[PDB]
Scaffold this active site. Sequence first.
Site, PDB file in Angstrom:
ATOM      1  N   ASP A 136      -8.648  15.427  28.349  1.00  0.00           N
ATOM      2  CA  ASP A 136      -9.360  15.462  29.624  1.00  0.00           C
ATOM      3  C   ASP A 136      -8.386  15.514  30.795  1.00  0.00           C
ATOM      4  OD1 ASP A 136      -8.424  12.868  30.270  1.00  0.00           O
ATOM      5  OD2 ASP A 136     -10.219  11.905  29.471  1.00  0.00           O
ATOM      6  N   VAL A 137      -8.928  15.481  32.009  1.00  0.00           N
ATOM      7  CA  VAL A 137      -8.105  15.422  33.213  1.00  0.00           C
ATOM      8  C   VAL A 137      -8.336  14.113  33.957  1.00  0.00           C
ATOM      9  CG1 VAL A 137      -7.345  16.663  35.250  1.00  0.00           C
ATOM     10  CG2 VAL A 137      -8.431  17.905  33.361  1.00  0.00           C
ATOM     11  N   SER A 183      -2.375  12.294  29.477  1.00  0.00           N
ATOM     12  CA  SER A 183      -1.543  13.119  28.605  1.00  0.00           C
ATOM     13  C   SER A 183      -0.854  14.246  29.372  1.00  0.00           C
ATOM     14  CB  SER A 183      -2.389  13.707  27.475  1.00  0.00           C
ATOM     15  OG  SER A 183      -3.487  14.443  27.991  1.00  0.00           O
ATOM     16  N   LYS A 228       0.821  -1.207   0.000  1.00  0.00           N
ATOM     17  CA  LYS A 228       0.000   0.000   0.000  1.00  0.00           C
ATOM     18  C   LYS A 228       0.859   1.264   0.000  1.00  0.00           C
ATOM     19  CE  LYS A 228      -3.639  -2.461   2.415  1.00  0.00           C
ATOM     20  NZ  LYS A 228      -4.615  -2.703   1.316  1.00  0.00           N
ATOM     21  N   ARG A 254      -9.357  19.839  22.921  1.00  0.00           N
ATOM     22  CA  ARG A 254      -8.360  19.626  23.954  1.00  0.00           C
ATOM     23  C   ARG A 254      -8.145  20.941  24.690  1.00  0.00           C
ATOM     24  NH1 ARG A 254      -5.883  14.802  23.219  1.00  0.00           N
ATOM     25  NH2 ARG A 254      -4.088  15.446  24.493  1.00  0.00           N
TER      26      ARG A 254
HETATM   27 NA    NA Z   1      -6.510  11.808  29.728  1.00  0.00          NA
END
Ligand code: NA
Length: 317
Positions: A169-170, A159, A54, A128
């Site tokens: 997110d937290v 993250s 590919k 984000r």
């Molecule tokens: Na997270």
Amino acid sequence: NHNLHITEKLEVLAKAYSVQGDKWRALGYAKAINALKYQEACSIPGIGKRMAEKIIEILESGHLRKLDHISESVPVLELFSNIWGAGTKTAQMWYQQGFRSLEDIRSQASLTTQQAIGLKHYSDFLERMPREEATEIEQTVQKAAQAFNSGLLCVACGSYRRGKATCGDVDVLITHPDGRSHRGIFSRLLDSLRQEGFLTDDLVSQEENGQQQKYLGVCRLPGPGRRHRRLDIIVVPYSEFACALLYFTGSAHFNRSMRALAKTKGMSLSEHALSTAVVRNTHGCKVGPGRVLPTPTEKDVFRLLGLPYREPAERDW
DNA sequence: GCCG
DNA sequence: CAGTACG
DNA sequence: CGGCAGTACTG
Ligand code: NA
Ligand SMILES: [Mg+2]
């Protein structure tokens, strides 16, 4: 990355297989797409002959023909699937039923409580936040926690901990180094955050039980210019802190790679602990429990697996 | 999809 | 239980 | 051939 003309074309394919429910094929693509991040194609791990071909079709031709013939349903399925609480099965069903827009879903679809909330915050959950906002959210949860009990340990994972500029997110991990100090801490923490008007919705919160392990919900800082953010809180025993820290820090791929490694050594790794002498059958399925190992720190988990330690920042993959 |  | 989610 | 991680909720 020296192959973006290629990866971005595979990426589209990755997501298409994922949303259509072909999860193992999507997994395969995801590996290859991170490798890239004919003889030489094969040479790289994660890249087989079929993937190599590919790439050559992209290198040589410039289009990718499987890309050409992706089902036109796929963008709609991805639209639907980005509703929190809806996945490939629900998305397909909605599609089958003739729905093609979020307006359709809103006016015609049957929705779970979770999905209604996901829809209400559709745009917000696609964004984000700057890692600085994550810091404020953590501090808000922490101070509420510490007010109820000082010395409690609160830490932002995911993250955020891996050092990313922005966070989807937290993730707040809470623990007490003084043995079993938390009884109904969730009861009080959440009531505390509710009174402040900090929590706006709950997605997952089994509060009727006692042994609620996680909270998944929605929060919003005070003042103008604020968006709804996702917030995940977990409370763990101190003996499970390193393994929880490791789990909740990720990445998801990093975790799965590490878990797959442990399985190769007759061991097992979870949010709860690292176990040895786990008994599994020919299909890789657990048929007998092993034995929990002491892991006071993350370094212990690595050490016990025979791995060199990796800083959170180096765990994106 | 990859690979043991 | 299937579906979805967490990292 | 067949595993691809190991968990925690909802209804
Ligand atoms: Na997270
Ligand atoms: Mg979804």
